[PDB]
């Protein structure tokens with residue numbers, strides 16, 4: 011194991027993120043036992059994860075990690091239980107993970123982080139009900155929004171627009187945000203207010219469409235420009251934790267749940283693949299930038315699974 | 321001083337965290353007992369069989385530390401009233417699990433949120449935990465003054481914030497609490513942890529929490545303004561509410577991260593201690609009535625029972641009361657005997673119910689100050705107090721004072737009196753039976769004689785107090801009516817309550833009573849305009865008395881005699897609380913009834929809704945004649 015790297019990795023795996031070069035980023039939390047903290051790990055060999063001794067870099071954070079995101083190719087943006095948004099930077103040699111900034115602006119657990127299209131700004135959502143826009147360079151909050159009436163479950167930056175992002179909450183709102191407008195959020199959704207939204211994924215090719223998962227295993231296809239829901243399917247038996255699109259020209263949608271399964275769906279939301287590999291909640295999913303049919307999942311069972319999607 | 325706690329949703333290492341909050345000056349810590357993000361499954365395989373441990377060990381703290389320093393918190397994903405069945409069932413099982421771990425640990429309090437209108441199943445699961453093992457533990461319902469939906473930034477283009485006045489809508493969170501504690505059947509173990517926002521609501525909304533069991537106040541760091549030196553401070557309005565809450569002796573909870581980063585978490589706390597120390601000090605009445613706040617006591621029945629020595633001693637610890645009696649006798653002697661008669665006219669003064677003699681000495685001080693001559697008869701039925709009187713007359717008073725060990729209604733007096741003086745009044749004026757006692761004595765008063773007191777009037781005001789209603793409810797005794805507690809009045813230093821309308825006079829008595837057909841029985845109808853949305857739990861009683869002319873005593877708050885602390889107010893409860901809406905009138909009916917043997921009160925509310933007639937035939941409560 012490298013220097014500064016913790017001798018042991020925390021059981022609860024929170025995030026799995028493939029970098030453009032192929033190096034896997036790992037977010038971990040200790041959600042039980044004596045100490046409730048976290049760790050950040052780099053795996054230049056994704057097949058060596060979760061093994062601690064066969065890693066490129068590793069660090070320990072003060073509190074657990076609720077959300078993670080690659081900021082470029084060296085930066086790591088962390089949503090902490092501490093109320094902090096943390097930015098860590100990879101070493102010149104990429105052998106250490108050093109803290110750039112740790113800012114305590116949120117009044118409760120920071121649950122969701124998203125990097126804005128340019129890579130200069132970021133958006134965070136919290137249990138404190140706020141949404142904050144961050145200037146990563148100045149290490150400051152530019153805008154704090156209290157649009158929601160309950161905890162912010164998810165925030166997703168639009169692919170190619172630095173002003174646009176999606177947000178969802180336990181207040182049953184899915185908000186479209188344009189910081190260019192005097193009133194930046196706009197309430198969008200289906201004709202009927204159903205089950206609470208739990209996950210969002212912007213479409214990688216159609217910048218006016220997104221997918222949203224709910225608390226009851228339903229996945230929904232939404233055109234923002236038509237503001238009425240077209241397709242929907244009961245994919246999972248429990249809350250949809252995450253939605254991640256394949257890098258493909260015609261993308262595949264990977265769906266995660268508390269039902270402990272992974273589903274891979276086509277354009278019409280039909281089921282292609284299904285993996286019951288996990289024996290605990292599936293927390294993240296990342297498609298390899300190298301082999302496009304290779305999808306990686308992490309759960310609370312401490313399994314780093316590598317699936318081959320047909 | 322201030323008892324305060326630190327609210328946290330992140331505790332990486334319990335020992336270091338506790339030490340840090342202790343260093344900062346906090347008395348206790350509010351913290352999760354399971355990891356807030358650690359969602360647990362109880363039904364579906366494989367997540368159900370998740371290897372343990374399910375949380376941190378109890379071994380990490382001493383029993384004393386768990387019992388006194390830790391307030392547990394329900395996990396935020398526990399949603400017993402969710403519209404998703406699977407969630408409802410897992411949240412029920414998770415709620416019991418966490419509540420049971422808190423009970424296992426012996427935690428002194430445990431926080432649960434009220435963050436939506438419907439908490440029916442949250443209440444069912446809590447109620448079921450309270451009825452599983454008898455424990456002392458408190459449940460603090462975290463409720464905001466302003467619901468987050470009514471606090472949200474007006475930034476949603478297609479969903480604007482309401483800019484219109486919504487009197488009842490702005491009071492919505494009080495109803496969340498009311499319904500929750502109604503469902504839970506007014507458990508004494510369920511109190512409020514009132515969370516205060518950056519913008520305070522209209523005063524009516526703050527007033528809705530009056531009379532409610534507030535155990536804690538939650539102050540987010542974000543509501544603190546920054547002063548010129550950079551220290552956390554509060555708005556004059558927030559300061560106003562802190563002073564109300566200090567009088568209620570609530571525990572102050574600091575939630576949120578440090579936003580005055582140039583300082584420490586002890587600076588938020590330092591400001592509260594500053595506000596606490598700088599509040600007005602306790603006056604004579606405020607120091608007297610210290611441990612008596614909302615403590616229910618049986619009204620004294622000095623006619624039926626002989627009062628103890630230490631009861632007359634506290635009775636005597638009231639300089640204002642006796643100064644007033646002195647001034648009343650002083651004024652009367654001067655009006656009764658002119659300066660040219662100041663040596664030929666010796667006034668025959670009678671102290672009727674003389675106790676240990678404070679009105680006998682007050683009569684003597686009055687005669688010396690008036691430079692007039694007096695003859696005194698000290699009448700006392702209590703033989704034990706008569707021992708003090710006879711040792712006083714032998715050792716000091718001399719032949720001037722004639723001690724009579726008799727009931728004033730049975731005493732055959734040798735001569736008539738010019739003035740009869742007495743202190744037979746209770747908190748409701750006539751409740752100790754001063755009318756009956758003086759009526760049976762006025763036969764020995766001269767045809768032109770004076771009674772000190774000459775007149776008295778009782779007053780009633782409608783009140784709201786879920787604290788006192790629950791206090792009365794807890795007065796169930798075996799071998800009597802299960803509801804008799806509500807059909808009797810209590811003497812209490814009414815503290816956590818809300819006066820719903822100004823007091824109005826109830827019964828008046830005049831002495832001497834020149835009626836050819838003397839009737840002490842009464843019937844009075846009172847109509848009380850209520851301008852708030854509230855819940856009626858009873859009627860506060862007070863009194864005013866005219867001793868002589870302009871010399872008066874009063875316990876009516878609007879005319880209260882300054883520095884006089886003999887009588888605390890009376891409280892007449894009602895079996896069932898009554899909902900009262902703004903603009904509605906509370907109509908009460910009060911009766912003063914009697915026999916040859918006993919006297920009592922009966923009462924009933926007839927608007928906005930009817931109550932049962934309370935204490936019919938004096939079945940629950942009588943005053944012995």
Ligand SMILES: Nc1nc2cc(O[C@H]3CC[C@@]4(O)[C@@H]3O[C@@H](n3ccc5c(N)ncnc53)[C@@H]4O)ccc2cc1Br
Nearest residue numbers: 622623635673675701702727728743745746757886887
């Ligand atoms: N609520 C309060 N009631 C007070 C009453 C007091 O004086 C009363 C009570 C004690 C006392 O010494 C005396 O009058 C006597 N007393 C009664 C009835 C009566 C009879 N019929 N004949 C003679 N004696 C008779 C009886 O024994 C004195 C102070 C009081 C303070 C407060 Br606060």
Ligand SMILES: [Cl-]
Nearest residue numbers: 438439440499
């Ligand atoms: Cl309800």
Ligand SMILES: [Cl-]
Nearest residue numbers: 616617618795
């Ligand atoms: Cl009692």
Ligand SMILES: [Cl-]
Nearest residue numbers: 817818819820
């Ligand atoms: Cl009041």
